[PDB]
Design a protein around this nucleic acid. Structure first.
Ligand SMILES: [Mg+2]
Ligand SMILES: [Mg+2]
Ligand SMILES: [Mg+2]
Ligand SMILES: [Mg+2]
Ligand SMILES: [Mg+2]
Ligand SMILES: [Mg+2]
Ligand SMILES: [Mg+2]
Ligand SMILES: [Mg+2]
Ligand SMILES: [Mg+2]
Ligand SMILES: [Mg+2]
Ligand SMILES: [Mg+2]
Ligand SMILES: [Mg+2]
Ligand SMILES: [Mg+2]
Ligand SMILES: [Mg+2]
Ligand SMILES: [Mg+2]
Ligand SMILES: [Mg+2]
Ligand SMILES: [Mg+2]
Ligand SMILES: [Mg+2]
Ligand SMILES: [Mg+2]
Ligand SMILES: [Mg+2]
Ligand SMILES: [Mg+2]
Ligand SMILES: [Mg+2]
Ligand SMILES: [Mg+2]
Ligand SMILES: [Mg+2]
Ligand SMILES: [Mg+2]
Ligand SMILES: [Mg+2]
Ligand SMILES: [Mg+2]
Ligand SMILES: [Mg+2]
Ligand SMILES: [Mg+2]
Ligand SMILES: [Mg+2]
Lengths: 117, 116, 62, 99, 305, 287, 97
RNA sequence: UAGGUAGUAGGUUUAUUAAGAGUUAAACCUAGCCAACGAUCCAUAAUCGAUAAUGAAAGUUAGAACGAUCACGUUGACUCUGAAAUAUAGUCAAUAUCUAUAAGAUACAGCAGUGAGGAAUAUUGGACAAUGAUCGAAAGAUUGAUCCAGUUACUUAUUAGGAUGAUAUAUAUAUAUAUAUAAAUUGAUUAAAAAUAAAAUCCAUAAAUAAUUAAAAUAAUGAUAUUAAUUACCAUAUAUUUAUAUGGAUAUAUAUAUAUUUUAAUAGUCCUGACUAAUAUUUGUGCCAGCAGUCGCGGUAACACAAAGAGGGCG
């Protein structure tokens, strides 16, 4: 109870809210700019200095940040059906409806997230 | 139900007086263990109406505070709801008639609406 | 352990079952314990009216 | 709402026989009244003096009949001739030794 | 140094001296008898000042310090009496100047030992009615009404509430004769609220005191540099006192479920942000602790929260 | 709760929340509470004794301690006398339903009020309550059944035999008076055992036409034409935090009682030093 | 004494053995000090006081030490203002609580 | 426990791996690395929180309960499948019981329960109705997870009755009613009380007895369950929960005039020399018997032992 005052007197914990987009998007321009700007050197430097070598097996730089094209992601995860009009039977129709609903929701969620950030 | 990720009710509260915690969880992890994401609550015991209110003809309500957008997202990524959860979602208006099983399947009195 | 036995009179042999608690007899040196008196072969102290639970004494029940 | 007695099971007794799980020996606690069986609920059955499991089963079969789903004696689950998953290994070995 | 002190009267009374072995009387009991005076065939202690109820709008609260424990008055004439050497009562030889000269504040002081506790005044029914009319028919704001009369806004609201209830009761014919008589007696007992008398009017500038104000601060400003209430509020990081007084004086998506003919209850779905909705995991069980939370239902049933 | 036992003894001049005759006498003959010639602890103890006897004698000590709030409340007038902060020690109990009911004068005592609400007579915002530990919010009405209020504030309804005996004496006095008038309607109680209508028929004085002294409406739970309680005056202290209407017996709880520059709204029969000592005690649980 | 109820500043004073520490107090917060100190405050009109005695707790020396601290360790705001040549406002008073 | 370390510290390569690395295996070099800011070695211990305790707080304590993490499922090693296992699987060995006596089977740290150990910790319960889980296309099957009840003052909470109440007779539009005889408990003879305490009196309410009807769950399914709750002779029909009017229920006098189930109350335990709240006193013992957290008390006047009276806490 004593340590709950750090977290606004909240006894018990929730699980961490799980990011819908798990990397920065392409539309987040400022982040991209920050990433691509010249990395500093000297006292508060990041990488390796130009003259200095790096260990044989290891990479010199850090790996590049995979920026999500959101439209591309949507297309891949949630492809619209190519065979557009093939639909008979009740169970099949139900499945199709379910699929459509899932497409709608995940599309909306991603787009909203992109806008929201 | 099927799946790895599943939207279900975790039980909370005391004996003879349940409240439910709508979560998304792993199928393997326990019923009341800490889940992936809590989406909402659900008290099954309906709000008790007054005698006058009953005479008039006003129905009790079951309160279900719920993150709609999150739930939708979870449905989209393919987290199968439980038999009770899916019914609740249908009642709310997230899920369609598509999810309604043969047992569930009667004239409607009051229609759904969003309010503020 | 050297245990004190309270009460006016007592019932303890050379083999009696006795329960020990962590009091201290202050005037006797080297005895840092009390036999708790209601329980075991040690019987409750007889004709005790005051402070009956401190000894074994049951309520006389008129 | 009362439903009509069908050709295959026109009587209460016939219905009981159909559903099974020892639903026979239950013709005395309620007499052969079709309306009576169907209108009756759980509390009434309990008062009369039937079992919990029997009560549960009958009501379910009534409901099925009302909805016109096929009623029949879906028997309760049975352990294997050898044994329950846990006890099999030993039991099977014992059986082999005997034979 | 504390003993067990039997609570005899501070004032002087006729103690026991000797008495017949069988009677077994106590000095406290004797003192009580004396205070009461003689009891009737009916049961009434008539000679006691404080037996009968005042019909004066002047509460007959207790003054044991002033009359020196001698409570007995003649009922018809309200003139004081004493217990003489004989068992019969009679008038006192010396008159009490303390009872004759008494203050305004102490007449509305129910207990002698606590000066701070005073009785609140009673509103006249006519005044209450006028207030009710103002709020409903004339349609004035409650603050204006409060300013006019000298009541507080919550008090005014309470009065209004009570008036409407009284009216409803009158319509139904629930206000019985006995109830009316009781109300009249109560009215007679208490002093009346005067809207003109400035000392009787309620102080309408009472704000409640916050935590930040109580903790004292001091500032070394230059000798000439001015520093008003606003500046002080700014230093403390509050809104000004006047603003708070003024304040005192003066969305979310909800769905409802479809209702089919058979089903017995609706499903109200309110929106809620994730990370803020659920019952938390590993919260403190407070049920076996004495700080356990006990709430109440819509039907007034006691429920563990 | 803690059982009622010797609440209104005289050898302990404990001033309880009641309108009892013995309680009144105790209040009368106490004077102050003497805190002279005592240690600090002894003073604190004597404060506890006196102050808790009035404020929540039914409450258990541990329970009280749990409910007891350190953070007292007050109001700045922003327009002089010194506010009595520490009279607020038992402000938290006025929030209780039972105490509020007592303050309203819908009960003779706090115990009685408690009993009333257990029996399901009080309401608060319509809904009936059977729970003394219920706490009013500001704006909450509460409403006792008017008969019970009348019983609380009314005289004790006499037994039939007692009433008949009283009547007999009154009749005799009347006869004596008429004899005296002449100079310058009998009843036999042994025969008339328990026939109330017969008694009524027999009796005819100017001040009661038929009804016996104590029974005009025997079915009602109080004295006859309703009159007040035998010592009602010295305890009728009209509170600030409640708004009352005695016609319907409704009462709006409008405020949590609070201390002003002049006064406190916690109605208590004790001076501020006593209340300070009590506060001191209950901060530390008598450490 | 500040506002006729408590000391001005948080004083910390040594009288022989006894080390005194007396903090000022917000109004309503009572006397929360050693029994001797409390007794002295009751007589001297101090309503609000926090504090704690370290080292010796010799009753007589507490009594002597605390009155010395009151008379000597305290400086009134007005005196301080006069000495320094500055305004020394009390913010709470200005606010009107 | 003061020196420890020799795959040890680092370099170069090859295998193995999804993948880094003296992680293993192999090969060849350099002489390192750690340490008195505590190495190596030994002992003890499952770890932790927005959990529990305590404090003014910094902190300290617990790690039962709720939750998160680890490890183990009698002991040790290895193998197989697999994304992931030294798997509660299999293999072999170790310890100890079973028969069926066999390149056998079992291992309650799953639930009940037993014996033991111990100061000390529960039913060989009911139900899958709910929430989950596995199988099944479904029908519905299983579920000692779970939900319910049982035992246990271990903890918390709510109730566990209010108002009036110091006598008994007899006599005789007012009202301080007044006399007379009798009685009156333990103390005590006055600030020595016990005692408004009892008993009486007025008023309910619980429980009971009848009637009714939820909710946990609905498509249907209720273990809990003589369910919670409500009404008091039931229903309908007006108004604003109360009030009145109807319909029928009922029973005596002579269809309609007064009624309408019943009804209580019951607390221990510690203490009264000071610290420490407890002044009404008395008896027994006599440095004994005994008391005692601490200082102490008991040698005939014991406020301290053992009791009666009275009192003070908590309940
Ligand atoms: Mg399946
Ligand atoms: Mg003792
Ligand atoms: Mg005892
Ligand atoms: Mg003392
Ligand atoms: Mg390598
Ligand atoms: Mg190594
Ligand atoms: Mg090698
Ligand atoms: Mg070391
Ligand atoms: Mg271990
Ligand atoms: Mg461990
Ligand atoms: Mg720790
Ligand atoms: Mg744990
Ligand atoms: Mg630890
Ligand atoms: Mg455990
Ligand atoms: Mg393992
Ligand atoms: Mg192992
Ligand atoms: Mg077991
Ligand atoms: Mg084992
Ligand atoms: Mg044993
Ligand atoms: Mg189930
Ligand atoms: Mg089972
Ligand atoms: Mg335990
Ligand atoms: Mg308790
Ligand atoms: Mg005697
Ligand atoms: Mg009842
Ligand atoms: Mg000494
Ligand atoms: Mg003696
Ligand atoms: Mg002692
Ligand atoms: Mg003693
Ligand atoms: Mg006694």
């Amino acid at each position: 109870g004593k340590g709950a005052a750090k977290y606004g007197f909240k006894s018990g914990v929730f699980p961490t809210t799980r990011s819908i987009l798990k990397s920065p998007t392409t539309k987040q321009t400022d982040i991209i700019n920050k990433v691509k700007s010249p990395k500093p050197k000297g006292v508060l430097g990041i990488g390796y200095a130009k003259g200095v070598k790096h260990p044989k097996g290891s990479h010199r730089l850090s790996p590049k940040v995979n920026f999500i094209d959101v439209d591309n992601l949507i297309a891949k995860t949630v492809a619209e059906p190519q065979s557009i009009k093939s639909s008979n039977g009740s169970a099949q129709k139900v499945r199709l409806q379910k699929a459509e609903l899932r497409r709608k929701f995940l599309i909306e969620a991603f787009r909203k997230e992109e806008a929201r950030l | 139900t099927c799946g790895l990720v599943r939207i279900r009710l975790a039980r909370f509260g005391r004996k003879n007086s349940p409240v439910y915690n709508i979560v998304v969880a792993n199928s393997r992890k326990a019923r009341d263990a800490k889940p992936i994401e809590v989406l909402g609550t659900y008290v099954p015991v309906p709000s008790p109406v007054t005698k006058r209110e009953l005479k008039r003809g006003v129905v009790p309500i079951k309160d279900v505070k719920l993150d709609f957008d999150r739930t939708k997202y979870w449905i989209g990524v393919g987290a199968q709801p439980s038999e009770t959860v899916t019914k609740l979602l249908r009642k709310a208006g997230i899920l369609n008639d598509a999810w309604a099983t043969s047992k569930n399947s009667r004239k409607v009195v009051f229609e759904r609406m969003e309010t503020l | 352990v050297s245990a004190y036995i309270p009460g006016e009179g007592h019932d303890a042999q050379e083999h009696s079952i006795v329960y020990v608690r962590g009091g201290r007899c202050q005037d006797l040196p080297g005895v840092k314990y009390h036999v708790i008196r209601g329980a075991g072969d040690l019987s409750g102290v007889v004709n005790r009216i005051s402070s009956r639970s401190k000894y074994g004494a049951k309520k006389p029940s008129k | 709402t009362i439903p009509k007695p069908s050709d295959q099971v026109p009587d209460v007794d016939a219905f009981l026989n159909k559903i099974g799980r020892n639903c026979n020996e239950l013709k005395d606690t309620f007499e052969n009244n079709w309306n009576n069986l169907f209108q009756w609920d759980s509390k009434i059955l309990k008062e009369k003096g039937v079992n919990i499991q029997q009560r549960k089963y009958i009501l379910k079969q009534v409901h099925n009949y009302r909805n016109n789903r096929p009623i029949h004696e879906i028997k309760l689950g049975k352990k294997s001739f050898f044994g329950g998953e846990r006890k099999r290994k030993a039991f099977t070995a014992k059986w082999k030794a005997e034979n | 140094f504390s003993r067990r002190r039997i609570a005899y009267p501070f004032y002087p009374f006729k103690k026991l001296g000797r008495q017949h072995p069988k009677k077994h009387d106590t000095n406290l009991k004797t003192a009580m008898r004396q205070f009461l005076g003689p009891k009737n065939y009916k049961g009434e202690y008539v000679m006691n000042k404080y037996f009968t109820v005042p019909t004066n709008h002047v509460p007959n609260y207790i003054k044991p310090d002033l009359e020196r424990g001698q409570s007995l008055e003649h009922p018809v004439t309200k003139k004081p009496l004493q217990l003489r050497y004989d068992g019969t009562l009679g008038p006192p030889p010396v008159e009490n100047k303390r009872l004759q000269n008494i203050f305004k504040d102490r007449l509305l002081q129910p207990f002698p030992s606590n000066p701070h506790c005073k009785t609140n005044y009673v509103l006249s029914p006519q005044l209450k009615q006028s207030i009710f009319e103002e709020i409903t028919v004339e349609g004035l704001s409650a603050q204006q009404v409060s300013q006019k009369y000298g009541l507080k806004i919550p008090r005014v609201e309470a009065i209004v509430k009570l008036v409407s209830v009284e009216n409803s009761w009158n319509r139904r014919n629930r206000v019985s004769s006995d109830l009316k008589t009781m109300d009249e007696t109560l009215y007679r007992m208490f002093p009346v609220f005067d809207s003109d008398a400035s000392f009787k009017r309620e102080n309408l500038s009472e704000i409640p005191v916050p935590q930040k104000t109580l903790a004292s601060r001091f500032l070394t400003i230059a000798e000439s540099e001015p520093f008003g209430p606003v500046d002080a509020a700014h230093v403390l990081e509050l809104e000004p006192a006047v603003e708070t007084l003024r304040n005192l004086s003066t969305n979310t998506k909800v769905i409802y479920g479809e209702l089919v003919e058979g089903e017995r209850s609706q499903y109200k779905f309110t929106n809620a942000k994730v990370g803020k909705v659920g019952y938390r995991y590993g919260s403190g069980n407070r049920d076996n602790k004495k700080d356990r939370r006990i709430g109440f239902n819509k039907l007034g049933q006691m429920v563990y929260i | 709760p803690r059982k009622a036992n010797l609440l209104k003894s005289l050898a302990r001049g404990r001033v309880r929340t009641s309108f009892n005759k013995y309680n009144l006498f105790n209040l009368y003959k106490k004077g102050g509470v003497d805190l002279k010639s005592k240690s600090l602890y002894q003073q604190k103890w004597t404060a506890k004794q006196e102050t808790r006897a009035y404020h929540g004698e039914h409450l258990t000590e541990k329970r009280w301690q749990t409910v007891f709030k350190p953070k007292l409340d007050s109001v700045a007038q922003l327009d002089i006398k010194e506010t009595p902060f520490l009279l607020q020690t038992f402000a938290v109990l006025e929030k209780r339903l039972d105490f509020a009911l007592f303050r309203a004068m819908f009960a003779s005592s706090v115990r009685q009020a408690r009993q009333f609400i257990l029996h399901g007579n009080v309401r608060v915002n319509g809904v009936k309550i059977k729970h003394p530990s219920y706490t009013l919010k500001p704006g909450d009405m509460f409403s006792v059944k008017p008969d019970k209020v009348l019983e609380a504030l009314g005289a004790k309804k006499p037994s039939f035999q007692e009433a008949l005996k009283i009547d007999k004496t009154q009749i005799v006095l009347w006869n004596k008076y008429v004899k005296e008038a002449k100079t310058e309607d009998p009843i036999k109680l042994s025969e008339l055992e328990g026939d109330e209508p017969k008694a009524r028929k027999l009796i005819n004085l100017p001040w009661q036409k038929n009804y016996v002294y104590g029974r005009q409406d025997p079915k009602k739970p109080f004295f006859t034409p309703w009159k007040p309680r035998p010592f009602l005056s010295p305890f009728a202290i009209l509170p600030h935090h409640l708004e009352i209407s005695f016609k319907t017996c409704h009462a709006v709880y409008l405020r949590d009682p609070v201390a002003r520059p002049g006064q406190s709204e916690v109605i208590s029969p004790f001076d501020v030093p006593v209340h300070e000592r009590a506060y001191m005690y209950y901060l530390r649980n008598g450490k | 004494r500040y506002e006729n109820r408590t000391i001005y500043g948080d004083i910390d004073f040594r009288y022989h053995g006894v080390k005194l520490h007396l903090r000022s107090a917000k109004p309503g917060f009572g006397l929360r000090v050693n029994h001797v100190i409390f007794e002295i405050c009751e007589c001297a009109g101090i309503k609000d006081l926090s504090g704690k005695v370290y080292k010796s707790r010799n009753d007589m020396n507490i009594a002597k030490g605390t009155i010395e601290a009151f008379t000597k360790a305290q400086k009134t705001l007005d005196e301080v203002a006069l000495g320094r040549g500055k305004k020394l406002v009390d913010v709470r008073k200005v606010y009107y609580s």
